[PDB]
Amino acid sequence: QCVNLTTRTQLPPAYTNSFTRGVYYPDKVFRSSVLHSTQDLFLPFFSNVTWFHAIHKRFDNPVLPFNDGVYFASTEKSNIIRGWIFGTTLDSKTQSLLIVNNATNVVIKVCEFQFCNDPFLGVYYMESEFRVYSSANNCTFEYVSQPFLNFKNLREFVFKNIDGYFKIYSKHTPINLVRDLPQGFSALEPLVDLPIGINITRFQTLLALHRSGWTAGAAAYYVGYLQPRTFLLKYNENGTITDAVDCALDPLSETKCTLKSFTVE
Amino acid sequence: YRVVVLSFELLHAPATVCGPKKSTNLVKNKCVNFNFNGLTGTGVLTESNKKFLPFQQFGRDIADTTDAVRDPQTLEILDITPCSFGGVSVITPGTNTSNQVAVLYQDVNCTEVNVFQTRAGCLIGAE
Amino acid sequence: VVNQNAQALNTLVKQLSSNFGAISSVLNDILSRLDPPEAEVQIDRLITGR
Amino acid sequence: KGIYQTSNFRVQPTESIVRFPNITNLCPFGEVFNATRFASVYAWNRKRISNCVADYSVLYNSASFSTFKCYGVSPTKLNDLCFTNVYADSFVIRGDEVR
Numbered sequence: 001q002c003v004n005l006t007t008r009t010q011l012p013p014a015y016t017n018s019f020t021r022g023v024y025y026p027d028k029v030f031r032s033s034v035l036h037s038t039q040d041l042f043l044p045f046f047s048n049v050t051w052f053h054a055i056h057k058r059f060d061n062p063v064l065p066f067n068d069g070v071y072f073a074s075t076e077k078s079n080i081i082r083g084w085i086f087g088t089t090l091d092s093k094t095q096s097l098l099i100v101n102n103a104t105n106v107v108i109k110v111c112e113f114q115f116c117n118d119p120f121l122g123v124y125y126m127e128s129e130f131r132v133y134s135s136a137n138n139c140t141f142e143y144v145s146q147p148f149l150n151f152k153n154l155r156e157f158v159f160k161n162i163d164g165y166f167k168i169y170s171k172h173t174p175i176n177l178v179r180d181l182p183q184g185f186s187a188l189e190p191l192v193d194l195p196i197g198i199n200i201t202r203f204q205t206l207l208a209l210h211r212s213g214w215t216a217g218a219a220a221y222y223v224g225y226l227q228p229r230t231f232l233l234k235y236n237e238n239g240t241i242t243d244a245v246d247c248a249l250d251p252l253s254e255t256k257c258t259l260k261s262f263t264v265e
Numbered sequence: 266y267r268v269v270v271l272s273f274e275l276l277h278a279p280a281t282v283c284g285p286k287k288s289t290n291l292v293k294n295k296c297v298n299f300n301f302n303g304l305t306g307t308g309v310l311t312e313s314n315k316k317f318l319p320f321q322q323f324g325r326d327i328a329d330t331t332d333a334v335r336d337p338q339t340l341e342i343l344d345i346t347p348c349s350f351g352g353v354s355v356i357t358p359g360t361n362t363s364n365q366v367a368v369l370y371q372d373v374n375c376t377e378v379n380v381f382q383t384r385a386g387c388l389i390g391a392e
Numbered sequence: 393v394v395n396q397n398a399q400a401l402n403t404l405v406k407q408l409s410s411n412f413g414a415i416s417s418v419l420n421d422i423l424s425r426l427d428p429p430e431a432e433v434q435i436d437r438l439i440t441g442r
Numbered sequence: 443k444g445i446y447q448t449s450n451f452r453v454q455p456t457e458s459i460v461r462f463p464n465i466t467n468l469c470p471f472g473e474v475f476n477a478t479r480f481a482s483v484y485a486w487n488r489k490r491i492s493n494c495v496a497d498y499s500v501l502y503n504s505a506s507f508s509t510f511k512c513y514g515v516s517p518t519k520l521n522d523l524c525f526t527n528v529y530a531d532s533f534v535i536r537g538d539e540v541r
């Protein structure tokens with residue numbers, strides 16, 4: 001079942017500032033009271049992240065590139081965001097990954113789905129509408145897991161795909177800010193690793209409609225891209241990352257990165 | 266006759282299905298060889314006070330040498346200490362005077378070798 | 393004086409995890425994964441670097 | 443008269459230790475070998491095995507199997523070689539045609 005929605009109000013997407021968001025633990029090594037230097041795929045400081053809305057009428061669900069990895073943030077209340085679609089052609093020709101969070105459980109499936117042009121779900125005022133795929137023939141991987149999940153919640157995710165391993169890092173934050181991303185520091189702990197071994201170059205997000213035509217709940221999300229660079233991370237005595245320095249932002253940061261210190265004489 | 270044939274495909278995808286892993290018993294306070302999930306070494310394993318985060322497995326020091334580990338069977342933290350080593354020196358007067366000697370084991374406790382415990386090591390053969 | 397001595401000693405300890413053009417910087421891994429005829433060449437590279 | 447450094451003292455390891463996580467989610471071989479019914483020769487049944495750990499020692503040591511044969515791998519070395527996936531094709535034939 002595929003349903004095309006034609007009540008959208010045309011408007012370009014917004015842009016906003018990253019601040020110092022998108023830092024994750026690069027490995028599983030405990031370190032205490034250390035300044036460590038790591039080179040990896042990170043979100044550069046003060047970068048321009050794309051802002052997509054869902055307000056009423058706005059219903060933003062376009063096909064986006066994946067590049068070398070994706071930072072996904074969602075400022076959320078009342079649980080509109082649900083999951084993601086990953087793959088290269090997003091049809092039955094090749095193998096695609098589907099991560100869904102319905103009202104009960106989190107379902108990860110690697111199959112050859114036939115995806116509709118506008119996949120979505122529906123909430124009745126209870127969930128009784130699920131129009132994402134029409135068929136799914138060859139399933140190589142299945143995984144049922146625990147649920148991951150003014151705006152009140154901030155959900156941050158990092159998705160990577162290296163040597164056939166899909167890595168997902170996640171973090172949840174209680175905020176009280178309305179429109180833009182809050183400014184601060186938080187490290188993203190590893191959430192899951194899947195040995196799917198498939199190519200990914202495009203991805204979709206999944207939203208839930210509100211029927212009482214149709215209405216989209218007030219939601220907003222931001223997308224940023226990862227690039228290879230060197231960071232200087234600060235591990236405190238309990239082994240938590242509490243600060244970072246981007247060694248390519250400006251000359252003072254490069255001085256700090258060469259001196260391996262957060263203070264310079 | 267009932268016949269079942271098993272075929273194994275090994276492709277560029279990550280390995281997924283294969284045999285179990287046989288674990289031994291865990292012994293502490295002794296110089297042993299050890300293997301923890303493929304991390305191999307030699308040393309003495311003792312009880313620790315460090316508290317890892319639930320996703321962490323290893324522990325490194327400033328010079329990037331492993332010094333703590335988590336037991337995969339029971340999620341407990343163990344410290345790793347190198348096995349004792351040192352120099353052995355002979356204290357003698359001249360052979361023109363006597364043939365008596367004393368021996369110094371450097372940086373070694375006296376219980377692991379007229380036994381006198383100095384800060385320089387363990388001295389045997391001297392009063 | 394203290395800082396220079398500590399820094400030199402740290403550099404010496406850190407140089408021990410470089411492979412110097414071999415396959416690995418761990419002697420045990422090379423010994424357990426390759427045979428003596430070629431582990432000999434790899435080990436010789438490690439020895440000259442160290 | 444003096445003190446001379448003559449030797450080096452080194453303590454030697456006593457035992458050897460190997461530790462690994464608990465064995466869980468074993469591959470369901472009993473779903474194939476102990477099936478209530480089987481398939482014909484021309485329409486043999488295929489099953490995929492992945493995302494589990496498989497123990498062939500219990501399968502090998504059973505005395506209920508008349509023929510257990512293969513050439514490219516020695517059966518005692520099947521507990522460590524680690525593969526992408528396993529295919530199981532089952533059927534029923536004549537006793538003479540097993541060869």
Ligand SMILES: *[C@@H]1O[C@H](CO)[C@@H](O[C@@H]2O[C@H](CO)[C@@H](O)[C@H](O)[C@H]2NC(C)=O)[C@H](O)[C@H]1NC(C)=O
Nearest residue numbers: 470471472473474475476477500501504505506
């Ligand atoms: C198929 O079923 C039989 C019978 O249930 C299994 O044989 C038993 O295996 C257990 C192992 O714990 C032994 O204690 C019993 O003595 C066995 N009984 C008989 C009659 O053989 C057999 O292992 C099963 N095969 C598979 C592949 O699951």
